[PDB]
Ligand binder design. Structure first.
Ligand SMILES: Cc1c(Cl)c(C)[n+]([O-])c(Cl)c1-c1noc(-c2cc(O)c(O)c([N+](=O)[O-])c2)n1
Ligand SMILES: Nc1ncnc2c1ncn2[C@@H]1O[C@H](CSCC[C@H](N)C(=O)O)[C@@H](O)[C@H]1O
Ligand SMILES: [Mg+2]
Length: 213
């Protein structure tokens, strides 16, 4: 089997069904003690939790689901009626994410989009009944952060106050995205310095709040 299947099996065998917090702790436990994996982790996840609780977004878009750790982390804090849409181009990973969300009891809150973000972003308004996004979590391939941010703006998916939260802006790093949002008056930026998941390597999240054209 794969590492992603072993993570899901550990959750199914150790986490409590319908308990998102228990599912998160099981994923973090397995990857801390057995196999490292690119989940956002508990250190940066706690910063994510605080950002989510401050802005209380009604519609969240996630770029990169992997095994569903970040989707479980964000969906467990959403108000009733709020929605999370997550895009995952790997079908093997998205099948794991769906089973992870089902186990945590959050399937009614999260919708998985199978495909590449650059192909799915232009179809959000028509196919998934989206006006503008309240929050965007960027966590896919690092070279897509900036072009997808420009694509989200072109398709009219950003409004004044839309919160962009970017992972891995230090390690592995997103230099072009970081330089663009920090240099553009369209984005007010705040850096939250933390640590790479399950490690003591320095990383951080960048919050970029859209201010308009
Ligand atoms: C593990 C590691 C170590 Cl020990 C060192 C020293 N360095 O330099 C790097 Cl770069 C890595 C590293 N490899 O992959 C990732 C990573 C993390 C994500 O959170 C993420 O989302 C994605 N991703 O591909 O989406 C990738 N990090
Ligand atoms: N262009 C793209 N469109 C959609 N998904 C992409 C993508 N490029 C990479 N990805 C996916 O994004 C994932 C990044 S790992 C992200 C982990 C997750 N956000 C968490 O914290 O738990 C990978 O699984 C990869 O398959
Ligand atoms: Mg990441």
């Amino acid at each position: 089997d794969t590492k992603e299947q072993r993570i899901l099996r550990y959750v199914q065998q150790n986490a409590k069904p319908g308990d998102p917090q228990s599912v998160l702790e099981a994923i973090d436990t397995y990857c801390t003690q057995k196999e490292w994996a690119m989940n956002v982790g508990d250190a940066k996840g706690q910063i994510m939790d605080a950002v989510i609780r401050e802005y209380s977004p009604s519609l969240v878009l996630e770029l990169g689901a992997y095994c569903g750790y970040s989707a479980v982390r964000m969906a467990r804090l959403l108000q009733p009626g709020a929605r999370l849409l997550t895009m995952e181009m790997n079908p093997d990973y998205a099948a794991i994410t769906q089973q992870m969300l089902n186990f945590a009891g959050l399937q009614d809150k999260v919708t998985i989009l199978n495909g590449a973000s650059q192909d799915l972003i232009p179809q959000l308004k028509k196919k998934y009944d989206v006006d503008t996004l309240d929050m965007v979590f960027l966590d896919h391939w690092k070279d897509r952060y900036l072009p997808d941010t420009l694509l989200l703006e072109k398709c009219g998916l950003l409004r004044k106050g839309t919160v962009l939260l970017a992972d891995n802006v230090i390690v592995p790093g997103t230099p072009d995205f970081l330089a663009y949002v920090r240099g553009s008056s369209s984005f007010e930026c705040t850096h939250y310095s933390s640590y790479l998941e399950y490690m003591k390597v320095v990383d951080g999240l960048e919050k970029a709040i859209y201010q308009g054209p």
